[PDB]
Amino acid sequence: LPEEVNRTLLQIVQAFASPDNQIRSVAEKALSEEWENNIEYLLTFLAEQAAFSQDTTVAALSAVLFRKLALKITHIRKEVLAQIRSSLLKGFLSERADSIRHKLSDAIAECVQDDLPAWPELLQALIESLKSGNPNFRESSFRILTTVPYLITLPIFQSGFTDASDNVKIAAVTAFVGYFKQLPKSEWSKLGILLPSLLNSLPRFLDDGKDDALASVFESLIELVELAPKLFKDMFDQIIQFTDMVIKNKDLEPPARTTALELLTVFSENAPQMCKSNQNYGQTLVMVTLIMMTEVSIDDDDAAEWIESDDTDDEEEVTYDHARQALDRVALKLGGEYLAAPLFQYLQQMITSTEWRERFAAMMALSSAAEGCADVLIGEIPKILDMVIPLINDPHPRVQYGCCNVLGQISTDFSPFIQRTAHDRILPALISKLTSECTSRVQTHAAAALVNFSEFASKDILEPYLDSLLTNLLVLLQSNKLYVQEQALTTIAFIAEAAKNKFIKYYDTLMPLLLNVLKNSVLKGKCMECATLIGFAVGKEKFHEHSQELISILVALQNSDDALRSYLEQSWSRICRILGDDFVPLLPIVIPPLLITAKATQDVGLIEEEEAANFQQYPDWDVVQVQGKHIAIHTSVLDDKVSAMELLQSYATLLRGQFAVYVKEVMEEIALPSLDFYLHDGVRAAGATLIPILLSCLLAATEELVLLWHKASSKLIGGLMSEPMPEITQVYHNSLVNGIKVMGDNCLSEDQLAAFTKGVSANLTDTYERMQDRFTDEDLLDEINKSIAAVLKTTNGHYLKNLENIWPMINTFLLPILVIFALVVIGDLIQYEQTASMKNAFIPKVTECLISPDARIRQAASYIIGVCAQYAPSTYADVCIPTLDTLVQIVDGSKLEENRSSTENASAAIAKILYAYNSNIPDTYTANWFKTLPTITDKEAASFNYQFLSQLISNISAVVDSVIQALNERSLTERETVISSVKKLLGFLPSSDAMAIFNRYPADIMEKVHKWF
Amino acid sequence: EPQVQFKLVLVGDGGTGKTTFVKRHLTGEFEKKYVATLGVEVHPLVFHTNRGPIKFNVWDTAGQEKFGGLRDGYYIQAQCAIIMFDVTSRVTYKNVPNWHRDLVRVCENIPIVLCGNKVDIKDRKVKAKSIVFHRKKNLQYYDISAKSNYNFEKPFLWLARKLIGDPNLEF
């Protein structure tokens, strides 16, 4: 190279190292910007430096850079590749530092390639160097064969495995495994034969005391098992016995023993049937993991250090941690069938040893094996408790903790069967560890294990143990350490569901202990939650004894410098459910934060191409592509918006008129704008459910109401045509219904009625279309029925006119879900004698429907016939009286769950006809009707029948019973007059005749009957 | 001043939190936006221990191949390393063996700590079960969170004990 070029490049490569960002950034620009025009010179330089520079940093960097830039070699002129190769190779064979020869070898490897010219000088250099008296030459040659295994395509590797230099051996093994890593399986059996030479070389490492080098070889062997487990079949016993021997030699440093364990473990993951076909594996594996799990609290028999620390793992207990996860891993792979026997053979022994570490080890080993061995151990369950539970009182606290751990683990792993059969042994055992006699760590771990057990235990099983659980946990609550206070509060809140009643008992000592913890965001929050759950449990009057203090701590907590914030909100809310309208004065503290959050805007922004690839690292954001562009919403922020709205809505629901102050602001700035949140349906839905509730809040307090309703209805209606999600469309109709119900009579205007019709039609249209393609649809149509009906009523029929324009659509539906829809619509039409225009278009199909095999169709049909007689008496008589016989037949599996509903509407339908055309009927009928009582399921039907029964007033015992049944079955209500009519009939009978009718009825319904008559 | 100092190379896939992790140590602030590192940024971190001030010169490298390019040249004369991955992104863990492989290409034998960052996030994709590369290579593993400071110092403390060779070293 030109001498100028050299000093410029040399400066740059040297500067490339400053820890200092300037010197090094300047060199970075220089390389990237100044150095297709210069690349060959640069590669030729860096190859020269690595080969010939006397400076170590320079030589190393250059070799590393050369390799890196080469992968960024094929597009280089052949005259220069050859010169590069020749200098790299001259460098390699010259006098270089070990690490530089390593880096030269790495660079040389980048110069061997399928498309690159043959380089037979390399091949020759490797073979010679492998025979050199310099280990580094030998080691470095294997390294090359590792990186470029194709150069390989037997005595070389056998000399390699046997070499006096450990470095060479490790590189031999590395190269040997690399071959299988890189080449196809068809090539494998060609080096496979060497595996026994390799394995036979292994005992030499322990003789020389070179266990660090053994660990490296174990690393390579681990990789080989994951590629070709079967290759090991013939010598499986030999590797097992060797790893056994290594692990037991506990004067060796951990790495040879932990990697030996991993070698053992990895056979279970890659050849389970191989492991299972050889009883030696299972026995060795259990034995060695057991030995390593005793290596705890070394040189500390009392466990002083462990007793004094927090409830996290000691990361100094390396072999123990490794052994735990290994046993777990093997158990999960091999199952209990195979492992229970070897496992238990050892546990039986160690449970009884005089060394505490072995009694602990036994617990932790069971703990590790339990899930994987569940298939067998879920049945050997008394046997397990017979070993474990005796140790719960070991003189040694870590053995105690160990036993708690197992009871916890198996309460999970053998659930729900263990909860059913061992509650009588497990709970007392764990509960006895709660006492302050025991050490903090043990109390805490036992308390944790009670959570595992409770997770799958019924309230009945827990009940007799609760007072005992609670009295003990209160003491834990008084510990000076937080990891016990916290775990105590986790358990009390887990149990709060059951003990909803047993707090009143413990309340007076508990609540101040709770207030003291509050006076660890996680701690404080869990404490808040226990506090307010206890307050709900013991009710408002008893809660008043500390409510003011609790409130004032909460207020200070909210105004102090996000897990906690979700606890404050839930707690504020539970206080509101306790306090009733006594929460009102807290609103200006509690609501405004909720308002801020609930007013978040949808924030859509243009992301840039390429920036979209990385946005994947903001998980609160989501990105969608629209045209050639990407846009993003802050989704998390909008989830929080829904959260806030869910809270404001439950405030408005609880506080009724008292929330009115907030209505207009919440309506206009939160509810309504939310309907336009196009990227987020949670928002839109929350916005809609809010509407009617707000109105009814303002109503209860007091034109404003009218303005807000007009705005809100129209936005709802507008949403109907554009809304993509039918689930959301259903919400909007629901919301309209509920709004109409709040606002009352004639609350919609004519444009609204028209805009509604369009909406309905676009929804009906798309429902039809989704279904001419194949509950979601049934439900939507269910709500559309409700909104049509709700709208009809507020107009008092006038909506009849609009209703027509979409009559063809209705009519298509009429001729099962679409049918039920249409029939229900028609029933609503008639309810508000101006439908004659349509009588002819539907009665043929309704009369058909009457006898339909579908109960739901008959129901809707008969309802229509009944409603015809009630609201349109005369424009329908030619129909009602003929069909009357059909109804007497539909009436007769009639009284059966599936069609009890249908036959009850027919029943009411005939009672309607009988009423409208009273003595203009061809009277057997009314006696037929009667035999259809009682009406116990459909409430609006029952409501007509008992009104008709009451207009009319042998069958007296049936007259009475008809009413008893309806009342007791709660189908007519609010037990609110047919009774007056009945008592008059019973008046006209003696003392004794009156009595006798109730003689059939049991005590509980006779209590109710006394309070009815 | 500190006379005990080490070159620490910090590698891992882009967006796993490497810079956020270092900034948190350096200034205590948590940076919310992702601004890819270009090449490398070298930051000194000084820990005050019961054996004196220990300085780690942290070479915060670029995880995005497009900004890396020559990353591998930063590995030179490093005395220890952290490989980071993202517990919420399975792909970052799947790349751990490649990061490891490259580091040992240059830095033959040297303590390496593997860190799974972002354990403060709800939906873990890389569960404790999955994470086992540390067993196959004898690396020390830790769950960490730059956001919550969970196990914040563990990686540096481990490396410090290992490199000083004193297990009683305390921060």
Ligand SMILES: Nc1nc2c(ncn2[C@@H]2O[C@H](COP(=O)(O)OP(=O)(O)OP(=O)(O)O)[C@@H](O)[C@H]2O)c(=O)[nH]1
């Ligand atoms: N929730 C959470 N977010 C984190 C955590 N650590 C980092 N982040 C965020 O993740 C993003 C990526 O952080 P960076 O630290 O710049 O990523 P980097 O690994 O340095 O990436 P490169 O420089 O491209 O290699 C930023 O938005 C951080 O705020 C964490 O522990 N928890």
Ligand SMILES: [Mg+2]
């Ligand atoms: Mg970075």
